[PDB]
Amino acid sequence: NNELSPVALRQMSCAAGTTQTACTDDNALAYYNTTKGGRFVLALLSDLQDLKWARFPKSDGTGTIYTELEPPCRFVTDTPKGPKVKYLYFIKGLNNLNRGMVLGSLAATVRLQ
């Protein structure tokens, strides 16, 4: 036994877009790492095809952080809506282990075909 992810973390919708100011508003579904030293976003599930720059205002509100959404990962899901053609973007510079946790939790609780 070497188990990938024993219990996982949560998700919230966040803002993202193509370029620096193209981040309009909530257009993503982001899994995040809730560490005591701040929340670290893990992954971005999107229904738009080409995003490259996501954003979230820092906890004090004065500052905001930008994340480069590196090239996506196609898949489709099962829902009452039917096929959901979605793309998985990871923050650029994601270690393999975090990709593993994201994909494990997704495939465990999100239906794929």
- Ramachandran angles phi, psi of 60, nearest 5°: -80, -10
Question: What's the gap between Cα 12 and its chain centre?
Answer: 9
Beta strands in 47-113 (DSSP E): 53-57, 64-77, 84-91
State in Å, rounded, how far the first CA of the chain is from the last one.
Answer: 27
Interface residues with other proteins (CB under 8 A)?
1-4, 6-7, 36, 73-75, 95-97, 99-100, 103-104, 107-108, 112
Residue 20 Cβ vs other proteins, minimum distance, rounded to whole Å: 24
The two tokens of residue 45 are 């599930």
Residue 112 per-residue DSSP state: B
Closer residue to other proteins in complex, CB, 24/34: 34
Closer residue to other proteins in complex, CB, 9/15: 9
Residue 2 Cβ vs other proteins, minimum distance, rounded to whole Å: 5
Closer residue to other proteins in complex, CB, 37/61: 37
Residue 106 Cβ vs other proteins, minimum distance, rounded to whole Å: 9
